[PDB]
Amino acid sequence: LPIPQDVKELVFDPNYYVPNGFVINKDRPMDVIYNPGGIEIRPAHLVADKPDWVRTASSANPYSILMDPAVYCRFLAKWPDNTVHEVYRKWENHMEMDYLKHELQDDLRRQAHRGGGARTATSYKLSTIMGDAKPVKEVAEEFREHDPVILEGYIACANNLEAEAGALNAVREALELSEDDVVPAHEYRAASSHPFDASTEVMYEIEDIRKEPDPHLIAKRLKQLMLDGKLAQRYYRFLVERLTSAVNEFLADSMSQKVTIDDFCEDIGDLIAYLIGKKGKSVADKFTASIPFIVGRSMCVNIDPEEGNSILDLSVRFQTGWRLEELSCLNIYTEKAVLISKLTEPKITQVIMGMAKRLNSSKDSDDARTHKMYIITADGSYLQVIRGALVDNAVLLKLIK
Amino acid sequence: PQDVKELVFDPNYYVPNGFVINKDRPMDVIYNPGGIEIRPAHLVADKPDWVRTASSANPYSILMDPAVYCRFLAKWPDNTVHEVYRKWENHMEMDYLKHELQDDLRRQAHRGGGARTATSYKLSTIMGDAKPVKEVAEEFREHDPVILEGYIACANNLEAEAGALNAVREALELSEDDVVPAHEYRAASSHPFDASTEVMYEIEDIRKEPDPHLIAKRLKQLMLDGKLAQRYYRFLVERLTSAVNEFLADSMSQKVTIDDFCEDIGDLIAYLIGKKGKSVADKFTASIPFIVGRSMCVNIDPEEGNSILDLSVRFQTGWRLEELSCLNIYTEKAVLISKLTEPKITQVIMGMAKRLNSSKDSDDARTHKMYIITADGSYLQVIRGALVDNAVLLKLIK
Structure with a gap:
């Protein structure tokens, strides 16, 4: 009643x-x-x-x-x-x-996503044990199923499947596993290189622009590099579209704002002024504080004289043995991102906390500013671990489509 | 008026x-x-x-x-x-x-002037029909457009462009100070598959199947029998769904979208028959071989491993995007190429299409995307338009 x-x-x-x-x-x-x-x-x-x-x-x-x-x-x-x-x-x-x-x-529609019959989520045996990850060296030295492990170094990837195959091969080599052994959930690092035919001094200048805390200075200095002929318009436009896409992604997912920018170097100041005026001070300050993360992800510069300078897509990935519909309900398909609360399964919080701690252990925590975060389900779904602005210390999982 | x-x-x-x-x-x-x-x-x-x-x-x-x-x-x-x-x-x-x-101030990233250079090298602005690299090299003024042999293994657009530039430089024995002509080449990217060779051959046969319903049924049955892992099945289905949605939005200007190819392709065909007439559905069915070939092109290499290929033929021009087209390329999904279009662009596109159709059974024409790459780096995919007979469209990749 x-x-x-x-x-x-x-x-x-x-x-x-x-x-x-x-x-x-x-x-x-x-x-x-x-x-x-x-x-x-x-x-x-x-x-x-x-x-x-x-x-x-x-x-x-x-x-x-x-x-x-x-x-x-x-x-x-x-x-x-x-x-x-x-x-x-x-x-x-x-x-x-x-x-x-x-x-x-x-x-019938969920047969592609759920177990039953002869269906296998992966071509191999992927362990369903979840929890905190440990360095693969001590795990190999100790040896039951293997606990979740961490792979040192980096895995060069051309696409997601290449990264997954490289990670699986790395885990199998580190743990000396066979083709039929149950491979555990693993944490690894992925790097994608986009070569740049620009002078090393220009590369250093863009790298220093990345560390700049003032986004207006970032845009002005990048455009000034373009205008002097130091940076070719091809590479400048590549960097600009990457920055624009990342800024729009952060606005849409992390901040839940319906506001988009066409290009970073001419509109970052306008966007920041708009966030000052219409969305209050605090929202703009958190956006400005997250600006280093966006710029580090978009404009990470690798400078190696041997194989040439390049721009890096850097990420840390945790491959779990759980399918997307076993880790999550169907809301993962209907929402841009899902929040992790206390009622959420503590093991996913543990793996994300471990990933964040390992990112923050770098020099000046710079890796936490230049690396994306992913959890890969067994059936191949990617969930980017992002931060939420509408809730303090909110951690979100966003399904990559 | x-x-x-x-x-x-x-x-x-x-x-x-x-x-x-x-x-x-x-x-x-x-x-x-x-x-x-x-x-x-x-x-x-x-x-x-x-x-x-x-x-x-x-x-x-x-x-x-x-x-x-x-x-x-x-x-x-x-x-x-x-x-x-x-x-x-x-x-x-x-x-x-x-x-x-x-x-x-906005357009300074796309137009010339001052000290701005579109590319780190010198790229010729001569367009036209392209010729095999060997005869052009042996003949040697700015070079005419060139065609390279083989495929350039690429991880991304920049790697493909660098590989093509290096190939042209090596084949034409050009120095760093020499002007490099506009050039046509081929790019291939591999997504490895931990699937058996028999399953890969079955997938290839499914790709050649003209009936989309049979494609869906056979791929789903491969998944359900455990021969195809759910990860790779979901990867292929995601590619098929993305390609079908792209063809609907771009080639057919249809707002209809699907979520799973193997679950909704029959419903999509029925919807197209019922609401769009037999002609639109037949056009989509005849384009189905192209979509499936682009999405599920199967490479079976016993040394390098079985994989799914993204194959394309790309012509790098010396003209910037805003020197090739007006600003409509930023507003529209794709732009139609008519007789009023610069004849050099059409010549390049028909040359690429002819070299595609010269393959056995025109198979490449069913498994290759086509791209025109501007000097400043824009990618214009050559697609077919179902709204006009023999319509060629350039779609800006964003």
């Missing part, structure tokens, strides 16, 4: 409140649930493609929360004001929900 | 009440009876109400010579935006507009 005001107050019983004209499905009791005040609770997978059932990012919960699908079921609750909130109900607490679970395991 | 051809290019031809013509910038706004309003394209590039309206007569933008024609957008009372290209030599009063495009 009482009307719930928030998520926790909702009653999980199809027979608790039954309005006129609604017939409860006998074999599908959980398909729709009604609560007083007009609250509609439906399984998320049954309303994934409906435009009127998208999560509402608000001040309290601007981010969709990541929870374990094997333990929790994700419902969407729609209120009279059309605000859609996540609800997470434990599988063991409500037995009458079991069929929904079976749906997610046995639908 | 009832037509684009009937537009009067005179600011003083029709002056509405309350409007004052700027003496220093008279070409900014043009008024024509009925409410037709013509403005330069680069003054209205950021306005959401100044986007070209694709119709039956002109479904695509037109690639043009920026040094010969100036782009203007004409807005009609029914909110339809059309293109008008007006020659520089026919209007002196438009000259300042040209200077703007040459001297704007």
Whole structure:
């Protein structure tokens, strides 16, 4: 009878409140649930493609929360004001929900993402043990399944599959594993090189521009390098489009802003002034503080006289034995990024914390400013570990599409 | 005026009440009876109400010579935006507009002037039909466009460009101070597969299958039987879905999108038959071999390992993007190449297409993308347009 005001107050019983004209499905009791005040609770997978059932990012919960699908079921609750909130109900607490679970395991569309029959997520045996990672040297020296490991050095990659193959070969060589042994979840570093035919002094100048804390100075100095003929327009435009793409990515995902810039070197000052004026001071200060991270990711310069100077795409990647639909519910497909809370499985928080600590151990923590962060599921999904601006110290996983 | 051809290019031809013509910038706004309003394209590039309206007569933008024609957008009372290209030599009063495009602070990254150089080397601005490198080298003035042999292993665009430049320099025995001609080459990138050779051959056979339903069924069945790992199946399905969506958005101008190829290709075919007619669906089905060949090109090498190839034929020109085309290349998804386009670009494209079709069973034409790379580094993919018969489009890669 009482009307719930928030998520926790909702009653999980199809027979608790039954309005006129609604017939409860006998074999599908959980398909729709009604609560007083007009609250509609439906399984998320049954309303994934409906435009009127998208999560509402608000001040309290601007981010969709990541929870374990094997333990929790994700419902969407729609209120009279059309605000859609996540609800997470434990599988063991409500037995009458079991069929929904079976749906997610046995639908034709989810066969590409879930186990069953002769399906194998990987061409090899990938361990499902998760937790903190350890250096691969001590793991090899100690040797049961291997614990998650860390590979030293770097892996040169042309694409994602090349990086994964190199990482798998590195783990197999470090642990002296066979083709049939169960390889563990692993942490590694990936580098992609884009050669630059520019003078070494120009490379040093762009490198020093990267370390500049003032974005206006960064843009002015890069454009001045372009205008003097020191940097070819091809390479300048390449760097500019990379900076623009990274800035737009940070604005869209990390800050949840609908604002985009066409090109960095002419519009970074305008964007910062806009963030001063329309979005308040604090949002602009956090954007400015994250500007070094964006510029380090986009404009990392490698200067080696042997094989030539280049621009680096640097990342740290944690390959887990869990599939995307075993690590996450279906919201990972419907949201730009998912927040990691206390209710989230502690092991993913542990792996992300270990990755962050290893990034911060570099000189001046510069690696944390120049490396992207990824968790690769067994079935090949990439989840970039990014920072969230709407919540302090918020860590997000963004599915790479 | 009832037509684009009937537009009067005179600011003083029709002056509405309350409007004052700027003496220093008279070409900014043009008024024509009925409410037709013509403005330069680069003054209205950021306005959401100044986007070209694709119709039956002109479904695509037109690639043009920026040094010969100036782009203007004409807005009609029914909110339809059309293109008008007006020659520089026919209007002196438009000259300042040209200077703007040459001297704007924003455009300094794309145009010449001062000490700006598009490339770190000297690249010839001679376009035309390309010739095999050996005869051109043995013949030796600036070189004519050149064709290289083999494939350049590339990890990214910059690596491919560097490899092509090195190949041209070595084959034409050019020094660092010599002018390098525009050159056509081939690029190949490999995504390794930890799949059995039999499964790879089955995937290759599925690629040649003309029925998309059979492609989906056979690939899904390979996944479900455990012969194809879910990781590689999802990789291939992601590539197929991306390619199908790209073909729909670019080649067919269709807003329809799919999420999984092997799950929704039949639904997409049924939707195209039901709502778009048999002709559109048949066009998509006939293009299916090209899409599947580009997405699932299978390389089987017992030494280097089996892989999925991204194959392309790229012609590096000496002209910058803003010296090859107007600013429409930034606004439109793709631009159509007509008889009004510079004949050199069409010559290059037909040469690349002919060299593609010279392969056995025209197989390369089904597995290769085509690119024109400008001097300052823009990539223009040559695609086919389903809205006009034999329509060639250049799509700026962003």
